[PDB]
Amino acid sequence: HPQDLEFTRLPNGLVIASLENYAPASRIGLFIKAGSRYENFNNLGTSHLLRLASSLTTKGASSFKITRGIEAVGGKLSVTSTRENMAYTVECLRDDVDILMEFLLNVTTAPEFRRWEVAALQSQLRIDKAVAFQNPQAHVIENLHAAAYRNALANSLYCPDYRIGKVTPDELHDYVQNHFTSARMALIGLGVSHPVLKQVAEQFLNIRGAKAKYRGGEIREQNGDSLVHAALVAESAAIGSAEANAFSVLQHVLGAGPHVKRGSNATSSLYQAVAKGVHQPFDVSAFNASYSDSGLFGFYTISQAASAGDVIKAAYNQVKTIAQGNLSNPDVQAAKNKLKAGYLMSVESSEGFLDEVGCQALAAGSYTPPSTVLQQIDAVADADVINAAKKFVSGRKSMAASGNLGHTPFIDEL
C-alpha cells in the first residue's frame, strides 16, 4: 500500500479528501458545520429532528425507494452529530458507490419535508428522547453544557419538552437554505477513487454568528438514584491550541479510560487519592470537551448519596496539590504515552480514521498527518501543565449535580 489521501479545496468552498486502500469497505463521510450552536431559540431541538430526518422523501427518489435501494445493495447509512458537526456516513463494498452517492446528495441538497412524515417523526422524537435520557449520564452532560454557557452552546442535542410537535417544516427549509452551504462541507472518501468523487461533487451540490460567552454556576437535578453524579468544569481553551493540548496532558495525568478491566488503575493518582480519602467504591474520571471557540475542562464523579462531597473535596485538593508543584516528569511522559495511545488506537479502523480526518479537514481547512501530530504531542512541556492546572483552580467554576444531593457543596463549601 504505497498510495495516500488527496486533498482538494473546491472554490465555492468545499473540502475533498480521497483515499484508496485495498480494503473492501468503501465509506463516504460528509461532515457539515451545522451543530447545536448554529441553532437558537426559534429552532429549539431542531438538530435532533434533522438527525432523525434521514428517511425523508427526496425530489428524485422517494424514501421507500431510498430505503429499499440502500438495503438492497446492503450499504449502511447513519447520521451522527456533535454540537458543531453533523455527519452522514454511508458504507458499502467498492463497486456500488454511485447510486448511494446519488441518494446521499439527494438527501443533503433536496429534502422535501412533507408534513405527515414530520408528525410521525415528532412521535419518533418522543421515543428517541426517551431512549436518550433513559441513560442518566448523557443527561448530566447536557445539563452541564446548560450550566456551561449563556448562549447557543447550551442548546441540547435533543428536543425539549414543550417544543415537541410545534416545529414547522418551513423553518426546516429555511435552516437548510441558510446553513447548508458549500463553504461548510467536508467530503471524505475511503476506498474509492478521487476523480469520481470530484466530478460527482462538482455535479450535484452547487449551493454557493459569533462565539458564545461564559455563564457559570450550578444546575441541581434532585433525582435520588443512590449514585450522585457530580461534574465540576471550568472553561479551558479553544480547539487545537497548545493550551488545550496542555489540558489534554493534564487529564491524562489525572485520569483516563479504564486500561485494566477488573483492575484498580494504580497509576492514576485521583483514584488512589480518593480511595485514601473515602474507603467506599467510587468512580472519578477526567473530562475535556473541545469546541471551535471554547473548551470545557473538569471532571465527573459517580459516588454514593452521603459520600459525595468528601470525594469532591479529595479530588479538588488533589488537583490543587498537583497545581502547586507536586508532579513527576516521568508521569508527564506517561501522560504523553497515554495521549499517544488514545489518539493512535482510536483511529485504527476506518470509522475512527474517518472521524478524525473529517474533523481535521473541516476544522483546520487542510490535512495534517498523525505522525507530526504525535510530534506536537511530544513537544509539550511541564509549565504548560502547571499553568493549565492553575487556570483550572483559578477561574469561575461550573457545577452540574444530580441525584440525592443532601451531601453536596454548593459554592462556599468547596
Partner: protein, 101 residues
C-alpha cells in the same frame, strides 16, 4: 370539436347535480385505502371546509331540500386539490408493486 366538447363537459357538470348541493370534485370520491390515505394527508383549512360542505350536503339530503339558485358552485370555480395527493398515492402503490416485481 374543441369548445363544443367543453360544452358537452359543462352540460354533464350541470346535469350531474352536486353543483346544486355545494360540492366539488373532491367531495364526491368513493373511498379506498388510497383515498383515505389522501384524506389523511390533507391540509387543515381544506379539511375543515371539506367536512363542512359534506355536512351541509348530507343535511340537505336529509330534509330533501336542494339549495336556492345563486348558491350553486358553477363550472370552473372548483379546486382540484386532491389529484396531486391521490395521484401520488396511486403512484406509490405502483411503486411498491414495481419494487416487488
Amino acid at each position: 370539436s374543441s369548445k363544443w366538447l367543453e360544452g358537452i363537459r359543462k352540460w354533464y357538470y350541470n346535469a350531474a347535480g352536486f353543483n346544486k348541493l355545494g360540492l366539488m370534485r373532491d367531495d364526491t370520491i368513493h373511498e379506498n385505502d388510497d383515498v383515505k390515505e389522501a384524506i389523511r394527508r390533507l391540509p387543515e383549512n381544506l379539511y375543515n371546509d371539506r367536512v363542512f360542505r359534506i355536512k351541509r350536503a348530507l343535511d340537505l339530503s336529509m330534509r330533501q331540500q336542494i339549495l336556492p339558485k345563486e348558491q350553486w358552485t358553477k363550472y370552473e370555480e372548483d379546486k382540484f386539490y386532491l389529484e396531486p395527493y391521490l395521484k401520488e398515492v396511486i403512484r406509490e402503490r405502483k411503486e411498491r408493486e414495481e419494487w416487488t416485481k
